Amino acid sequence: TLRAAVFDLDGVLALPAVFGVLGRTEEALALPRGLLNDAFQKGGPEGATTRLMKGEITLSQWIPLMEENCRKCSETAKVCLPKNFSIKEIFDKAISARKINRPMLQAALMLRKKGFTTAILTNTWLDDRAERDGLAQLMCELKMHFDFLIESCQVGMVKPEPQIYKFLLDTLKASPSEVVFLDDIGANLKPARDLGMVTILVQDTDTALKELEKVTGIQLLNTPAPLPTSCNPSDMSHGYVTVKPRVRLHFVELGSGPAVCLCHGFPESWYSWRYQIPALAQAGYRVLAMDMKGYGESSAPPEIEEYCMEVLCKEMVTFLDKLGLSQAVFIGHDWGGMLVWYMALFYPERVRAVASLNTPFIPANPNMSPLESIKANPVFDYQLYFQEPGVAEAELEQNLSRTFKSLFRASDESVLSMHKVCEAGGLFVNSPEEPSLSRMVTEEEIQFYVQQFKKSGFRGPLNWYRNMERNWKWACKSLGRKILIPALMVTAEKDFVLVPQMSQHMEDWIPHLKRGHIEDCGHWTQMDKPTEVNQILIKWLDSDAR
């Protein structure tokens, strides 16, 4: 019958509570017990703190009123406050110490996932201090995980006034018996309980969570590690930049701080970085996830030479120029990974740092055509099949659902044989016509790629493979160079085409190269091991790209 869960901020979703810091300051300063809490509440509904919580005055206007409340309390208590007493210092440290209670947030996320409406109902102030950014940052991280955020200072009502609970019920469109309410202050539970709501008094998180599992019938404690927060395309800021008359690049943007450009592989989308876009923004970076040329909402000219590495890299520099970015960190995977190594070799001044997932830095061999080196390895046979225009397009566009379901698979789910593709006469010759859904992706995620490839088709994406000779000649120009800017190479143990051993001689070209390695990871790295990728990238960015 329960369908809504309301949480308080201070003491429930964020720890420690302000009141806890007030009690700890009395002990540290050897003041009489409760003196700071008495000054805090002095006057009740007509006092300074109620005016602050109703949004009548701001935090800075309240600080001198709280200080005089402290002196009046000490006069009565017959004590002297220390020579260096400051409400501002005490409050700054208290607000700064507050961190998200991860287990409490994890339980809130699981409830919403199972169909619950979630909300935060809190008594808070209009923060105008010089350090107010810390509070804003915390609220933003929490905001995206709940259906509603109700703050006292915005609605002009405070807990425990009964009208704020009537307002809460009208916002949720729910009756009181369909609501569970969590708060660390007993007084605030009393009116919710009077209306008939299920209340949980929060003293310690683990006990609070056990009461919550019992009443909802959903397991919250001891639960498996969840996947990182993913992107909803319709909630993203969508950017459009024209780099040349017929070419427009589309990107998705989130966060503030140093620019980080993400470059996908074949046959993918900006959406392949869905698990890293919120994580990198939260770590303090401005993320720009591209639809590469030939894909999604980016332009897709039909000409083959529009997709050679030289044209592609030049358009990426123009993209930075039109956005007003002197530098960006470049992170690529698959074809995008090959492109970022060549961005570092040809435009080092525009690249703050460079990282590749799966794709090693392959220097051109001046004594051998790339097409002849492809024939030496039977694993690369699918590349020869991709050369004839129209042939692979017809097979991949014939059934879009089948195409993405057969390709996007974890290492133990492979349904295609990438060798003898030419001899068989296709990629899907001895392949099931209706493949099973991989554990890595959902039907909804697959349908995004199907919808994006319904507009463009496979011509543009396949053309990245039809410039082998042209790319080989261009790469030969960089044979005497070394990559001396910060660099990261991440290998994936189970990629059968881009094997980790293909990257072993990279130190000869990138002497101070840093490495990452992911076990039990196939070709589709970002969606196969999203947590591991996030950890490797965030640690490297914080040490080498700052």
Ligand X SMILES: O=C(N[C@H]1CC[C@H](Oc2ccc(C(=O)O)cc2)CC1)N[C@]12C[C@H]3C[C@H](C[C@H](C3)C1)C2
For a copy of itself, the binding residues in 330-359 under the rule CB under 8 A are: 346, 348-350, 352
Return the one option of ligand X, a copy of itself, none that residue 546 interacts with (CB less than 5 to 8 A, by type). Answer: none
- One of 250, 275, 333, 334 is an active-site residue; which one? 334
Cβ proximity to ligand X: between 299 and 359 the closer is 359
Residue 242 binding result from a copy of itself, ligand X, none, given CB thresholds of 5 to 8 Å by partner type = a copy of itself
| Cα–Cα separations (whole angstroms), residue 151 to 80, 158, 159, 539 | 36, 9, 10, 35
Number of residues in contact with ligand X, rule: CB under 6 A? Answer: 13
* 3-state class (DSSP) for residue 59: helix
Is 477 a binder of a copy of itself (CB under 8 A)? yes
Among a copy of itself, ligand X, none, what binds residue 482 when CB lies within 5 to 8 Å by partner kind?
A: a copy of itself
**409: contact with ligand X by CB under 6 A:** yes
Spatial separation of the C-alpha atoms in residues 394 and 259, rounded to whole Å? 38
465 noted as active-site residue? yes
Please count the residues of this chain forming the interface with a copy of itself, following the rule CB under 8 A: 55
Both tokens of 376, joined, read 């030496």
Please list every residue from 137 through 156 that binds a copy of itself, using CB under 8 A: 137, 139-140, 143-144, 154, 156
Asked whether residue 508 is marked as a ligand-binding residue, the answer is: no
- The two tokens of residue 329 are 């960190």
Place of tokens 């102030």: 125
The listed partner (a copy of itself, ligand X, none) that binds 108, CB under 5 to 8 Å by sort, is none
| 182 versus 355: smaller Cβ distance to ligand X | 355
| Separation of alpha carbons 356 and 255, rounded Å | 22
Task: Return the bridge partners of 535, or none.
Answer: none
Q: Rounded to whole angstroms, how far apart are CA atoms 387 and 6? A: 58
Report 309-328 residues binding a copy of itself (CB under 8 A).
321-327
The end-to-end CA distance of the chain, in Å, is: 51
Shortest gap between Cβ of 493 and a copy of itself (angstroms)? 31
Tokens 């190269």 found at: 513
Cα angle for residues 203, 207, 211 (degrees, 5° grid)? 110
Q: Which stretch binds ligand X (CB under 6 A): 50-58, 65-73, 233-241, 412-420?
A: 412-420
Residues in a beta bridge with 241:
249
184 is in an annotated binding site: yes
- Residue from 58, 106, 373, 401 in contact with a copy of itself (CB under 8 A): 58
Among residues 295, 342, 449, 465, the one annotated as catalytic is: 465
> Which of 60, 399 has the CB closer to a copy of itself?
60
Name the amino acid, one letter, at 253: E
User: Is 463 annotated as ligand-binding?
Assistant: no
Asked if 523 is an active-site residue, the reply is yes
Assess 402 for contact with a copy of itself (CB under 8 A).
no
Closest approach of ligand X to the CB of residue 362, in Å: 6
382 marked as part of a ligand binding site: yes
Residue from the set 25, 37, 50, 60 that interacts with a copy of itself by CB under 8 A: 60
What residues numbered 248-287 form the site for ligand X, per CB under 6 A? 266
Range in contact with ligand X (rule: CB under 6 A) among 196-204, 271-279, 414-422, 529-537: 414-422
What does each C-alpha distance from 345 to 311, 351, 353, 481, 532 come to in angstroms?
A: 15, 10, 12, 7, 27
Q: Which of 20, 27, 41, 26 is nearest to 99 (CA)?
A: 20
Q: Which is nearer to ligand X, 183 or 334 (CB)?
A: 334
> Is residue 529 a contact point for ligand X (CB under 6 A)?
no
Q: In whole angstroms, what is the distance from residue 310 CA to residue 503 CA?
A: 23
Q: Is 443 exposed, middle or buried (0-12, 13-18, 19+ CB in 10 A)?
A: exposed
**Min. distance of Cβ 492 from ligand X in angstroms?**
11
- How many other β-carbons are positioned within 10 Å of the β-carbon of residue 536? 20
Residue number with CB closer to a copy of itself (73 or 252)? 252
In the annotation, is 235 catalytic? no
From residue 236, alpha-carbon distances to 125, 247, 287, 288, 454 in Å are: 29, 22, 12, 11, 21
- Alpha-carbon distances, residue 204 vs 104, 108, 281 (angstroms): 11, 16, 31
Q: How far is the CB of 546 from a copy of itself (least distance, A)?
A: 12
Q: Does 217 bind a copy of itself (CB under 8 A)?
A: no
> 480 contacts which partner out of a copy of itself, ligand X, none, CB within 5 to 8 A by kind?
a copy of itself
Beta bridge partners of 287: 254, 260
Looking at beta carbons, which pairs linking 216-222 to residues 24 or more positions away fall under 8 Å? Answer: 216/2, 216/5, 216/111, 216/116, 216/180, 218/110, 218/111, 218/114, 220/106, 220/107, 220/110, 220/111, 221/103, 221/107
Joined together, the tokens standing for residue 73 give 């309390």
359's contact among a copy of itself, ligand X, none, with CB below 5 to 8 A by partner kind, is ligand X
Known binding residues for phosphate: 122-123
Please report, as ranges, the residues that interact with ligand X according to CB under 6 A.
266, 334-335, 338, 359, 407, 409, 414, 416, 418, 497, 522-523
Active site residues: 334, 465, 523
Known binding residues for substrate: 382
Please report, as ranges, the residues that interact with a copy of itself according to CB under 8 A.
51, 55-58, 60-61, 126-128, 132-133, 135-137, 139-140, 143-144, 154, 156, 234-242, 253-256, 259, 281, 286, 321-327, 346, 348-350, 352, 477, 480-482, 484-485
